[PDB]
Write a protein that binds this ligand. Structure first.
Ligand SMILES: Nc1ncnc2c1ncn2[C@@H]1O[C@H](COP(=O)(O)OP(=O)(O)NP(=O)(O)O)[C@@H](O)[C@H]1O
Ligand SMILES: Nc1ncnc2c1ncn2[C@@H]1O[C@H](COP(=O)(O)OP(=O)(O)NP(=O)(O)O)[C@@H](O)[C@H]1O
Ligand SMILES: Nc1ncnc2c1ncn2[C@@H]1O[C@H](COP(=O)(O)OP(=O)(O)NP(=O)(O)O)[C@@H](O)[C@H]1O
Ligand SMILES: Nc1ncnc2c1ncn2[C@@H]1O[C@H](COP(=O)(O)OP(=O)(O)NP(=O)(O)O)[C@@H](O)[C@H]1O
Ligand SMILES: Nc1ncnc2c1ncn2[C@H]1C[C@H](O)[C@@H](COP(=O)(O)OP(=O)(O)OP(=O)(O)O)O1
Ligand SMILES: Nc1ncnc2c1ncn2[C@H]1C[C@H](O)[C@@H](COP(=O)(O)OP(=O)(O)OP(=O)(O)O)O1
Ligand SMILES: Nc1ncnc2c1ncn2[C@H]1C[C@H](O)[C@@H](COP(=O)(O)OP(=O)(O)OP(=O)(O)O)O1
Ligand SMILES: Nc1ncnc2c1ncn2[C@H]1C[C@H](O)[C@@H](COP(=O)(O)OP(=O)(O)OP(=O)(O)O)O1
Ligand SMILES: [Mg+2]
Ligand SMILES: [Mg+2]
Ligand SMILES: [Mg+2]
Ligand SMILES: [Mg+2]
Ligand SMILES: [Zn+2]
Ligand SMILES: [Zn+2]
Ligand SMILES: [Zn+2]
Ligand SMILES: [Zn+2]
Lengths: 150, 150, 150, 150
């Protein structure tokens, strides 16, 4: 970290302690050139990454939007709410594993599709019909044929 | 009617015309105090037969249940809200024409399918996949073959 | 209004009453052919047109965005909140008077500048500096010259 | 740092990198038990002199009041958030170099103007129009003249 006083590039960590019930790291740093001392805080970014929509508008990640889309596709299917919640938790872990501040809605959609393939193939076709915006009934056959290769 | 802008107690009807295939009256009103103009719609509020559900439980006719089911199927389809409202008016009209105190769920779903077959074929498949509760992915092709056959 | 029972094109209004604290008109209509009676409700359409942004993205009309921009321009200016609210009401009235489903944000901006020119000329220049996205300081004098005519 | 997901006590720092033009440390941390990965930011928290407002009331130094004013002036200007954060860090460094327990509002305003003069001249005029509370439109030209005289 650069010194906030003289802007020398190397600062030394002289002390460290956990704060905020172990969720943050409070440090004491010392400038090697101007010898000034200062406090720093290390805080995690726990909020989910923002979503870049199809029209390039950014909006905060909305877990209810993700879930309600899956529940429309899973209508009348033999998938428990625990299976859906585990699938949502897996999608959320993958989004966080990217390390990105923002992720395109296309990444969320692709991740939902993979979970739906494992959970219920009828639900997968229903979701794909909207996510891939089918304009002709021919597209159902094409999506099914693709699924039948794997 | 009171002015929705300045809350003056009387408004003058400046223009009137039949809309919704003669089922509604669209009016243009003008406030005599603030001179603002606005549009109003006059719609009938009729008694609808009760709905006998698949499990034989009776429940009142719920126009929102009818509408939301259609809108799920019509996602991203080029059908206007006016086309949907005309389809809903036609469905409600047919249920009323039976003269029955109650009508089965199946009759409503069947009537919706007739409308969706005229409005959008992709919507028809999406609705049929839930209404006819598809269990295998091959049921999409079979519904397509049947749809194209009538 | 057409009869919802026999579909005769003629129904006579036999009674009228204000409901919803004067905001709606309840009518009792009678078909001249089948003599059946039914109730109707007349309600106003208070929907501000959607906004077409500079990048062609549509978004609902947001009164707070409109006001927030004017209050930035009016900082430290002798214009009362009543003057601002009357200016906002006038802008909303003009957008509604277009009869359009959607209006470009450019129309909203032009309308706010028209109000700001009447309210406070300093505010007008401040708003124009962002609305017209000034890239050089010479644009302030250029905007003043344009105003110091009409 | 403790894992914010499973609450295991010692997350491993798997990556570290300077951000915000060297003023902050971005870390990537991994829990050794649940294997979840998350991002953290290390930022300095410095003691700052109190602010003596125009009415002689003292109030603690509020970085957000300083930043939000600059961001209003920098609207639609080609200045990155890193340039803004470096300007604020420079302001903070200069206020600390005075050694003063309290500093007048006027000193902060003048220091912001010196940074805005380097970052963007349009932003400088916008800020000056409110900071120097322009009462008439000729003050814009007068400020542009004093500015173009360095
Ligand atoms: N804000 C959000 N938070 C979480 N999931 C989202 C969000 N917006 C969309 N999703 C999900 O992202 C996936 C892709 O959505 P999709 O509708 O294709 O994208 P979009 O950017 O919303 N485009 P469009 O609907 O065409 O305007 C679906 O699983 C959505 O439910
Ligand atoms: N109370 C209701 N009023 C109006 N339409 C309804 C009502 N209940 C269901 N519908 C519609 O009737 C059609 C058939 O619905 P469907 O789901 O097949 O019937 P159901 O009795 O609800 N059976 P199930 O959902 O399997 O328990 C669809 O268009 C529904 O939206
Ligand atoms: N959704 C909205 N509802 C109401 N007023 C709005 C809305 N969006 C923008 N405005 C106002 O419309 C006027 C023009 O805004 P302007 O910033 O030029 O448009 P824009 O489409 O947002 N472009 P940009 O900001 O460059 O991406 C201003 O008075 C805005 O405050
Ligand atoms: N408490 C504060 N901490 C840090 N910066 C501040 C604070 N208060 C004001 N500023 C900034 O100081 C500069 C001068 O603000 P200015 O508005 O001229 O001062 P003031 O005392 O708030 N006067 P006034 O707003 O007229 O009551 C601007 O950059 C403000 O954003
Ligand atoms: N009728 C449906 N059947 C099956 N899946 C559906 C249906 N409607 C939506 N989904 C699924 C697939 C879509 O890509 C996904 C998201 O739909 P969408 O209506 O775009 O909402 P969203 O969550 O992306 O929010 P937004 O309204 O901001 O676009 O949900
Ligand atoms: N994901 C979907 N895609 C397309 N159409 C759908 C979808 N989900 C529902 N629909 C349509 C077809 C269904 O037969 C119809 C009604 O669905 P359903 O969930 O049973 O509600 P409903 O209106 O019958 O109420 P209830 O909850 O009382 O059963 O809506
Ligand atoms: N610093 C400012 N001084 C004066 N007027 C301003 C200032 N910032 C914004 N405004 C005015 C002029 C702008 O054209 C108008 C709208 O600004 P903008 O930030 O684009 O917001 P908006 O209301 O259009 O929403 P959005 O964030 O969706 O673009 O507000
Ligand atoms: N519309 C604007 N355009 C450009 N810069 C602006 C605008 N509004 C405010 N600023 C800048 C210049 C002002 O001197 C500075 C501070 O504004 P002000 O509203 O006084 O807040 P402040 O940060 O001093 O807090 P306080 O509310 O305590 O006075 O921000
Ligand atoms: Mg979407
Ligand atoms: Mg049902
Ligand atoms: Mg804008
Ligand atoms: Mg102030
Ligand atoms: Zn130093
Ligand atoms: Zn009125
Ligand atoms: Zn009749
Ligand atoms: Zn863990």
């Amino acid at each position: 970290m650069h010194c906030p006083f003289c802007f020398a590039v190397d600062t030394k960590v002289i002390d460290s302690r956990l704060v905020g019930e172990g969720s943050s790291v409070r440090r004491r740093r010392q400038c090697l050139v101007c010898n000034e001392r200062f406090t720093t805080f290390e805080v995690a970014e726990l909020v989910m990454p923002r979503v870049v929509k199809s029209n390039d508008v950014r909006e905060p990640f909305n877990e209810e939007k993700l879930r309600s889309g899956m529940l429309r596709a899973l209508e009348k299917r033999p998938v428990s709410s625990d299976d859906v919640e585990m699938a949502i938790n897996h999608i959320k872990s993958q989004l966080r594993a990217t390390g990105e501040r923002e992720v395109p809605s296309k990444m969320i959609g692709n991740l939902v599709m993979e979970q739906l393939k494992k959970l219920d193939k009828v639900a997968y076709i229903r979701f794909a019909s909207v996510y891939r915006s089918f304009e002709d009934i021919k597209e159902f056959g094409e999506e099914i044929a693709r699924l039948e290769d794997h």
